[PDB]
Every structure is written in C-alpha cells, then in structure tokens.
Structure 1
Amino acid sequence: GEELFTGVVPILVELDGDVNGHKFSVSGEGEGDATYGKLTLKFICTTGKLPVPWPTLVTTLVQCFSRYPDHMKRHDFFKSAMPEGYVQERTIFFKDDGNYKTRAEVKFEGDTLVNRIELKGIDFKEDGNILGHKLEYNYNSHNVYIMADKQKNGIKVNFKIRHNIEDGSVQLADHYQQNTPIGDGPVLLPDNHYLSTQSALSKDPNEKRDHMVLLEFVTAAGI
C-alpha cells in the first residue's frame, strides 16, 4: 500500500451511530496527504443535530494517513493492509460515564479511501459531560501507542484522549484499539512505537447543518 499514499488521496467517511438510543448519522469528505501526515476533512450530521459533542467523535472519524518517516516504513501496518483494507475496532471508556464501541472498515473504493463506521454508545448519563454537551469545541495533542498482535496478524493500540470540559476540568476517554487486515495478504507487523497527533477543530461560516471542520497532523515516532 505504500505507493497508494505518495500523493493526495480523497477521503469519504460514513458513520452510523446510536448512543443511549439517540440515533444519528455522520458523513465526511476531504483528502489526506500521508507524505505530510496531513488530513483536511469536513463532517456533517446528516440526520440533524449531533446527540454527542463533535470532539468525542474525532478518533472514530484514517491512520493510514499518518506520516511514517523513512526509517520506520517497515512499521506502517495501516498502509501495508491496503488496498484490501483493515478492520478497526475500539472501545472508548469515558471516565465516570458511558462507553463507545466502534467497528469500522477502511479500504479503497477506486481512488477514494473510505472509512465506514458503526458506533454504539451505552450507559451514558443523559446529563453527563457527553449527552449534556459540556465539552469544549477543541482538541489536544496526544501520543497513540502501537503494538503488534502477531497472533491476530494485526496490531493493538492504546491511548488516552483528554477532552477539555467547559468548567476547566478534564474528561478522560480511555481508548483500547485493535486493527486486523481484511485481505489474506501479508502485512507489516511493527515493533513498539507511537503516533504523535494534533488536531484543530473549526466551523464553516457558511454551513447551516451541524458540522465539524478538522485539520489534523500525525507523524510516527519512537524509533
């Protein structure tokens, strides 16, 4: 897959979610430039108002677009699984609140890199920081820790996202991730390393639908 990410690739994102019964759908389009670990996307809630804060959806809403330096190419599982793609599953535990469980398939459909997602959220407090919409519209920089999972011929991923709360406090979201290939072809199983992330959220001053504009940079490191 390395060769498939040398230039600007277009991206399409589709998420179907249900959090405590509140059903919703999100669509997103943009492009990724893995050579600069760059992502520019704009997401729309296609069913109306989003029943959770936009930032809680950022991790769910294409790590194959992370910049893997030359001396780490042999560790880029994400791109190695292309174009057949890979399944990405997660369990996001929101401290003192509910948890999201997600399953997605990211692969190529012609030239378009597609991320199809199903998200299920349960045990949220209808009046907590998530359902009550008390998280600020911003995003911090984190370190995504990656590990090989030889027995599953995939990887294991763990990290902690810190969502700023409107009162100055912090809402922790423990991420437990698993990625496995969709094809029966070989993939790169990586030594331990991590991805350094940063995201900036903004609004489109001409968009009336509930939405999020995301600019994100990610680069592999730790080796």
Structure 2
Amino acid sequence: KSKGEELFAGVVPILVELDGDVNGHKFSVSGEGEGDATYGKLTLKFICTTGKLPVPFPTLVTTLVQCFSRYPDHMKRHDFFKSAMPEGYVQERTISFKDDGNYKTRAEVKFEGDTLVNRIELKGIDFKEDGNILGHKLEYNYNSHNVYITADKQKNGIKANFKIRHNIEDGSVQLADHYQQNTPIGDGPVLLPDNHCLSTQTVLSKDPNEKRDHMVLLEFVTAAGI
C-alpha cells in the first residue's frame, strides 16, 4: 500500500478556494465538504462569497480534486493523483466554450494538515455578454462524462482531454472543451499511468435555507480501463 493511497483510506475533509475574473467580473467561491475515495464519493457545498456569481455555477464544477477518484484494485498503479500526495500537484486547464469565451485555470491541490485543499485562480475572457454563460442560460444540472487520461512522461505528470456537455435552456447543449495538465509539486516518485478514463457522475442541488448564491454537489468517480 502506497503512501498516497493511505492518506485517502478514510473520509478526508476538503477545502476549496477559488478566485476568479471573467470578462472583468470578479468573484470568489469557497467550498467545504468531504471525500471518501474508497467509494469515489465527494460531497461539497460551494458559496459565492462576493455575492452574485457572474457565471453559471455548473460552468465551475470541473474547476472546483480527482485524487478522490476510486481506482479499482487492479488499476491502483495508475493513480497519479494520490501518488503525488501529501506534497500535491498543480492542475492547469483551458476550458473552451464553443462559440464563446474560455477559462484558463491554475490550481494547487495538496494537504494542509489533515485537510485536502484545492486553491484555484481562474481567468475568463472573450465571453459574449448575451451568450449562454454571461447570459446565465445554462440549466442547473450536470451530465456524466468520461475524463480521458494519458501520461506526460516528460513532465512526470499527466494530461487529460474531455468535453463537458452543458444543457442549455432552449434544449440544445453548450459544449466546453477541456484540456488539462497535472504535474507534481514535490519530487518524490509518482505513478505514471497507462491510458485510462475517469467515469464521473455529478448531482447538483440547493439548500432551501441558504440565501447566498451557492451550489451543493454530490459526485461519484470511478477509474475504468476503458
């Protein structure tokens, strides 16, 4: 049993902190909850702390800890994410919304004591003021996706590619193309994986007693040799 995997054997508290800027509209999101990697399960509540969120919350889901994925016993050697802990890894993405703007994100995820922390900076540009994103035309739900993972031996890390389908209110879909790079923060040995995928499902909801702009989130992720 590896060092990284032992950190995740039980329930781990999670803290998420995001600072964003989309077309100049600034905002901060704080999140709290917990992760149970044994079942690939995340439970989290996110609050926009600067008031009204200038984008739809669902567009932030991928940005807002894949170290909580479940790798089945036979795939444990492909779990780059836990192998980088506790020192952690940096996760960077470009998210490109079809016929609209893009997010660029840089995040550091690591332990601070017993807590798994995801700290993110986000910058969005090229967004249409009347588009699906700034126009808040996205439905408040979330589809299931396959995140595809390849080793990046040269950087001792991984890359990932996938397309998020955001249900639009008129019945169409808003496509968000994700290109992602992860590299370790420490220089201990990490696991470099063969091609595989993270099968992820996400359920979004609301706390009727919470008046602040927020998102409650339940997620299940399983690694598959698919």
Q: TM-score range by the shorter chain?
A: over 0.9
Q: Where has structure 1 moved over 2 Å in runs of 4 or more?
A: none
Hey, what's the Cα distance between the residues in 1 that align with 2:16 and 2:129? Answer: 27
Q: Per the alignment, in what secondary structure is the counterpart of residue 64 of structure 1?
A: helix
Structure 2: unaligned runs, 5 residues or longer:
none
Q: Return the offset for 1:155.
A: 0.1
1:151 Cα shift? Answer: 0.2
Distance in 2, matches of 1:7 and 1:206, equals: 30
Indicate the SS of the match to 2:74. Answer: helix
- CA drift of 1:161 comes to 0.3
Q: Following TM superposition, by how much is the alpha carbon of 1:45 offset from its aligned partner in structure 2, in angstroms? A: 0.2
Give the Cα separation in 2 of the matches to 1:127 and 1:32: 37
Q: How far apart, CA to CA, are the structure 2 residues paired with 1:70 and 1:4?
A: 16
Deviation at residue 195 of structure 1 after TM alignment: 0.4
**What residue is the counterpart of 1:91 in the other structure?**
94
Deviations 1:27-49 (A, max 9, x none): 00000000000000000000000
**CA deviation string 1:174-194 (max 9, x = no partner):** 000000000011100000000
In structure 1, how many angstroms separate the alpha carbons of the residues matched to 2:35 and 2:175? 28
SS at match of 2:201: strand
CA deviation profile, 1:93-126 (whole Å, cap 9, x unmatched): 0000000000000000000000000000000001
Normalising by structure 2, we get a TM-score of 0.98
* Aligned match for 2:213, one of 201, 210, 215: 210
- Which residue of the other structure, out of 125, 139, 144, is the alignment partner of 2:142? 139
What is the DSSP-based 3-state SS (H/G/I as helix, E as strand, rest coil) of the residue aligned with 1:71?
Answer: helix
Deviations 1:126-182 (A, max 9, x none): 110000000000000000000000000000000000000000000000000000000
Q: TM-score, normalised by structure 1?
A: 0.99
Count of matched residue positions in the alignment of Structure 1 and Structure 2:
223
Please state whether the residue corresponding to 1:72 is helix, strand or coil. Answer: helix
Q: 2:106 aligns with which of 95, 103, 108?
A: 103
- Tell me which residue corresponds to 1:122: 125
Residue 53 of structure 1: how far off its partner (Å): 0.2
User: 1:80 and 1:204 mapped to 2: Cα distance?
Assistant: 35
Structure 1 CA distance for aligned equivalents of residues 130 and 118 of structure 2: 30
Aligned position for 1:44: 47
Q: For 1:163 and 1:24, how far apart are their aligned partners in 2?
A: 21
**What is the SS of the residue equivalent to 2:154?**
helix
- What is the CA-CA distance between 1:222 and the residue it aligns to? 1.5
**3-state DSSP class of the match of 2:107?**
strand
**Aligned with residue 76 of structure 1, among 79, 86, 96:** 79
